[PDB]
């Protein structure tokens, strides 16, 4: 799995898409996405988000490399029922340049 590079102090607009989460079960089952980790649901909270129905990772705010250089988050894929379909997927986000 490849890290996502985001230049610091981007113009936006925000929120902006960064990368789309894909499961190899997507063709078979309608998959809903959520994220956790420092940057999403623990501090700093709400910097990153995800579009539940599409899997598109969103960045809500411009990133400052002097504050935080790197983020490690977890993607979660569930069915309509709420049943998990995968182990948590690791999401690495590096701030450039």
């Amino acid at each position: 799995v490849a890290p996502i590079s985001v230049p610091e102090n981007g113009k936006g607009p925000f929120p902006q898409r960064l990368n789309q989460l894909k499961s190899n079960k997507d063709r078979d089952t309608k998959i809903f996405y959520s994220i956790t980790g420092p940057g999403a649901d623990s501090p700093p909270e709400g910097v990153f988000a995800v579009e539940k129905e599409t899997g598109w990772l969103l960045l809500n705010k411009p990133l400052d490399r002097e504050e935080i250089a790197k983020y490690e988050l977890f993607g979660h894929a569930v069915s309509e029922n709420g049943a998990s379909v995968e182990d948590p997927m690791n999401i690495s986000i590096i701030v450039t340049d």
Partner: single-chain antibody
Amino acid sequence: QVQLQESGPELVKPGASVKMSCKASGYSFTAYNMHWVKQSHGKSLEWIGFIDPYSGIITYNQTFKGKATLTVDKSSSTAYMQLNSLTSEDSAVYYCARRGYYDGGFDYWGQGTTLTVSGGGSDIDIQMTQTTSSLSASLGDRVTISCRASQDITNYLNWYQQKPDGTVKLLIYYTSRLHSGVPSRFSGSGSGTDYSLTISNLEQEDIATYFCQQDSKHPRTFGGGTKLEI
């Protein structure tokens, strides 16, 4: 390497049940969905359904609802299909196949389990027609095999190759992209409702039957196949 070992041939009387195993190895069993398919002599292929071994969610072709029961044993990396209320019409070769990619395709297949025995609903069922059933060409030639869908399937079209073994391989998924280990001389194209597979420099290895399959909508459906001699 990725392997799916299916259990031995079955010979049962009408009215009985039977249960086939499909043992996975060479990958993380729960990270991929497992699909089953039926092939009646000689070569027609029908999609039964799939199980997600992680969640346990199952989806059946309305056709096999009640006839087939899919389960898994996580601790042994084994998928199971039970077939009930058996009749002569259930006599077929049955297959295990792994869901390979986000864009579709079944990337690895078991060798098949032969069953000899001495259902339907309101979903629309996309018809895949391969207009040529049998084709004879020479060694070294280039040859085009065609496939048509009753509906626009937006490039979700895959091609499989079956040898007179029974063994099946994925050649191409999502219209044009090649499964690993598949030589460049196989290539596919198409759009909307019309698709085709092109093989160049025919070899002895290519004597086989080639099947298209749509991955746009449930239930999954296959074409009737095109047989290739010399």
